[PDB]
Structure 1
Amino acid sequence: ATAMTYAQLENLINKWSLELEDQEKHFLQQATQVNAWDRTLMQNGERIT
């Protein structure tokens, strides 16, 4: 198969780390949206009470 070398391993690790950081940013955006929705629901409930 393909002969794995130090440069190839470094490139693979860097690509995996970039994908991990992209997934973390997406999860952070989703969490921010969830927190905004929770704040809106809390305000609506406090007004309804």
Structure 2
Amino acid sequence: QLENLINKWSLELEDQEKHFLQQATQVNAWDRTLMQNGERIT
């Protein structure tokens, strides 16, 4: 029972890590494009 709960939380943690990287990583890509467009506008 404890081992099944540990395995469930490990899978939920890996899925949350992937979701967090997608939420981050995309914002960081937009920030780079926004900065480049700001330099071009300037």
TM-score of the aligned structures, taking structure 1 as reference length: 0.78
The alignment yields a C-alpha RMSD, in angstroms, of 0.7
Which runs of 5 or more structure 1 residues have no equivalent in the other structure? Answer: 1-7
Deviations 1:4-45 (A, max 9, x none): xxxx10010110111011001100011110111101101111
Which runs of 5 or more structure 2 residues have no equivalent in the other structure? Answer: none
The separation in 2 between residues aligned to 1:19 and 1:35, in whole angstroms, is 24
TM-score of the aligned structures, taking structure 2 as reference length: 0.89
Question: In proportion to residue count, which structure has more helix?
Answer: 2
Q: Which has the larger radius of gyration?
A: 1
